[PDB]
Swiss-Prot record, chain B:
Disease in which the protein is involved: Angioedema, hereditary, 5: A form of angioedema, a disorder characterized by episodic local swelling involving subcutaneous or submucous tissue of the upper respiratory and gastrointestinal tracts, face, extremities, and genitalia. HAE5 is an autosomal dominant form characterized by onset of episodic swelling of the face, lips, hands, and abdomen in the second decade of life.
Name of the gene encoding the protein in the UniProt record: ANGPT1
Residues of the full protein shown: 282 to 498 of 498
Cellular localisation: Secreted
The protein's assembly and partners: Homooligomer. Interacts with TEK/TIE2. Interacts with SVEP1/polydom. Interacts with THBD; this interaction significantly inhibits the generation of activated PC and TAFIa/CPB2 by the thrombin/thrombomodulin complex.
Entry protein name: Angiopoietin-1
Disulphide bonds in the chain: C5-C34, C158-C171
Organism: Homo sapiens
Length: 514, 217
């Protein structure tokens, strides 16, 4: 329904420039990307209308470049919204003096309700005042001048969910801006627990994935996908479905990524450090290099992807043999649609060896709602999913997408749907000739109330007692002999479109007798 | 013609109350509050906080002569506390209490402060007591600061950050003359009435009371 990525081109400001690029993977149109200062999570920021220009290295993205030296009032926290159907979505980062006095040793922490956490800062620029700790821009506590540790710690045991946000650290006699910033995320439930009360369990997400506490699905680290984040996404690619490219010739050795709130921020997979400048020490591979290689039979270790199994083995650690699991592909979808306005049963077809199950198959209304399978066929290859809409109308005319998300990948394909309205004629028919046993009539129906191409015309008739009708019509002006003698008759015109809902009401109508 | 509460107790008065002490080369007394129960009695109270009736955010001239009432919340006055610790050598105790109903005390063997041209500079020694292992007041001293005296060994202005008047290092680990915080606010407040090695930097305590009597008792 929405793929929103926040790119921080290095969160540590020097004299050179830094930049914030907010990327959306969407299409027709492009929901207005907000980028503003994040005044809530760090109060007392200095207010400045920041210029949101547009970015052109990608399909749709807006970027905020402060130019070298003018990197002044940029200290603070920031955000970008992307939204969907009444539902929002925002990703939060920070920007700070490279100098400053301290260094958060990590921009965000993802921790679960009731964990002991050690929120730190490396002590850099030693001065003869005290150290101080600020969350939400509200005061906490500090450190006397002479007993200032080397790693300024803050211990929080059994962290509650109302106990998180952005943390500061400065040398007392200082700016709310000379500080150093770290963000703390505490989810409603403990790890591997999610739901509106904590009574369900997460899709277990490998590769350092983080399990959303609202959906039980996983927000994957950049360069990995699936529901369980297990998928070795291509070289120098990121996102939900890994269709996006790192610009820089050495890949992502300076892009700090940032993800939907339940995750936080991190380097591309292959990069250790605060600036992602640092290569990963051998035997480690994940995002920040936080994943250790447990390759069973000694297969090479890749700083980008993990275990490089010998042919015929696959798995996190080459701990399983089997057919090489293939990522799904949405098959026999066309580019264009045009259906007529009524009940509607749309059909997604997806190949792949993980062979989708209707849990894993969805559809997205142009507005951005998720629709789930009302039934499931299947076959040998290709699971097949069928959906239903109440009445589909001409305002749902736009792009819709098939979402297939199995354990060894995610794919999406689109189709432009042009809902057309039914005909219905404008005018009554007009009567040409009367008589004892017959009548003749101008079928109106050249002025017609809707649109489309008209394919059959059917003639309707009744007395005043019951219903009947008919006659599939092949010239505009019509002759119904074999009639009674003196009845009141009622005549209605009824037009037709292209397949499915093509009936479409009649109104018109005159009356006669002989 | 007696000059502190220890004399009041020598003279047989074993009850706590308001008394009047006259000071040497001080023409004109001061009503004070004498504490006669603690340890052995004979204590002379230089400041009392318990409710926050009184505002501690004041200037030199105000902190010089003292304010508040000896009955409820108060401060003695520095040209008094100075005028009293030049007569001899005094010991210092400090009576804390948080909101969960918990006494504590720091207690110091030597205590003296220099004059007005010396910024009532702090000179303590021998920190004992339940209020932390280490001394939450700085013993070696730096000068006394108020809202119109940047005297702290800090570069900022430590009066107008921690409120009132106290002995500010680069903002020391204490401020019993700060901001009175009621029950509930008393968590996570910084310019509060604090004492590090006891209840934590972000606490605002409940009932402080600083006091002196001479060594010899």
């Amino acid at each position: 329904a929405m793929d929103l990525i926040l790119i921080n081109s290095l969160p540590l400001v020097s004299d050179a420039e830094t930049s914030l690029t907010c990327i959306a993977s969407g299409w027709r149109p492009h929901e207005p990307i907000t980028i503003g200062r994040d005044f809530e999570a760090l109060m007392n920021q200095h207010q400045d209308p920041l210029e949101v220009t547009q970015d052109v290295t990608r399909e749709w993205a807006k970027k905020v470049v402060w130019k070298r030296e003018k990197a002044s009032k940029i200290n603070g926290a920031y955000f970008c919204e992307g939204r969907v159907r009444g539902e929002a979505i925002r990703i939060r980062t920070m920007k700070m003096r490279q100098q400053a006095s301290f260094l958060p040793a990590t921009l965000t922490m993802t921790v679960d309700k009731g964990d002991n956490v050690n929120i730190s800062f490396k002590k850099v620029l030693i001065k003869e005042e005290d150290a101080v700790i600020y969350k939400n821009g509200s005061f906490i506590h500090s450190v006397p001048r002479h007993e200032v540790p080397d790693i300024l710690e803050v211990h929080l045991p059994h962290a509650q969910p109302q106990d998180a946000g952005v943390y500061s650290a400065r040398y007392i006699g200082g700016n709310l801006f000379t500080s150093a910033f770290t963000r703390l995320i505490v989810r409603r439930c403990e790890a591997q627990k999610w739901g509106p009360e904590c009574n369900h369990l997460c899709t277990a997400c490998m590769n350092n994935g983080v399990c959303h506490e609202d959906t039980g699905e996983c927000i994957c680290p950049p360069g990995f996908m699936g529901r369980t984040c297990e998928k070795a996404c291509e070289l120098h690619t990121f996102g939900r479905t890994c269709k996006e490219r790192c610009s820089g010739q050495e890949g992502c050795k300076s892009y700090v990524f940032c993800l939907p709130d339940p995750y936080g921020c991190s380097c591309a997979t292959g990069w250790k450090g605060l600036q992602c400048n640092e290569a990963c020490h051998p035997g480690f591979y994940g995002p920040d290099c936080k994943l250790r290689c447990s390759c069973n039979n000694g297969e090479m270790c890749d700083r980008f992807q993990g275990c490089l199994c010998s042919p015929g083995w696959q798995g996190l650690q080459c701990e399983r043999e089997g057919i090489p699991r293939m990522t799904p592909k949405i098959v026999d979808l066309p580019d264009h649609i045009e259906v007529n306005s009524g009940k509607f049963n749309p059909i997604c077809k997806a190949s792949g060896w993980p062979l989708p199950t209707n849990e894993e198959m969805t559809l997205v209304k142009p507005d951005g709602t998720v629709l789930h399978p009302k039934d499931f066929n299947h076959t040998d290859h290709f699971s097949v999913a069928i959906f239903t809409i109440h009445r589909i109308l001409p305002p749902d005319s736009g792009v819709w997408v098939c979402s297939v998300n199995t354990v060894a990948g995610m794919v999406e394909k689109p189709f432009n749907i042009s809902v057309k309205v039914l005909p219905k004629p404008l005018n009554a028919p007009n009567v040409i000739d009367t008589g004892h046993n017959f009548a003749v009539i101008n079928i109106s129906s050249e002025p017609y109330f809707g649109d489309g191409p008209i394919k059959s015309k059917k003639l309707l008739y009744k007395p005043v007692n019951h219903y009947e009708a008919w006659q599939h019509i092949q010239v505009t002006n019509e002759i119904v002999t074999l009639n009674y003698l003196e009845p009141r008759t009622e005549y209605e015109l009824c037009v037709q479109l292209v397949r499915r809902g093509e009936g479409g009401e009649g109104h018109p109508g005159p009356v006669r007798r002989f | 013609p007696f000059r502190d509460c220890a004399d009041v107790y020598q003279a047989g008065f074993n009850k706590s109350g308001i008394y009047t002490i006259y000071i040497n080369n001080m023409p004109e007394p001061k009503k004070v509050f004498c504490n006669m129960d603690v340890n052995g009695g004979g204590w002379t109270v230089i400041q009392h906080r318990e409710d926050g009736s009184l505002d501690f955010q004041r200037g030199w001239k105000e902190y010089k002569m003292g304010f508040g009432n000896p009955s409820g919340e108060y401060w003695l006055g520095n040209e008094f506390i100075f005028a009293i610790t030049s007569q001899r050598q005094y010991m210092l105790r400090i009576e804390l209490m948080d909101w969960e109903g918990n006494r504590a005390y720091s207690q110091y063997d030597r205590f003296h402060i220099g004059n007005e041209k010396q910024n009532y500079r702090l000179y303590l020694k021998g920190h004992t007591g339940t209020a932390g292992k280490q001394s939450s007041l700085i013993l070696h001293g730096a000068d006394f600061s108020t809202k119109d005296a940047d005297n702290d060994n800090c570069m900022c202005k430590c009066a107008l950050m921690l409120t009132g008047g106290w002995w500010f290092d680069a903002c020391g680990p204490s401020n019993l003359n700060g901001m009175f915080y009621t029950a509930g606010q008393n968590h996570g407040k910084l310019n509060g009435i604090k004492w590090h090695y006891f209840k934590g930097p972000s606490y605002s305590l409940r009932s402080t009371t600083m006091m002196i009597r001479p060594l010899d008792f």
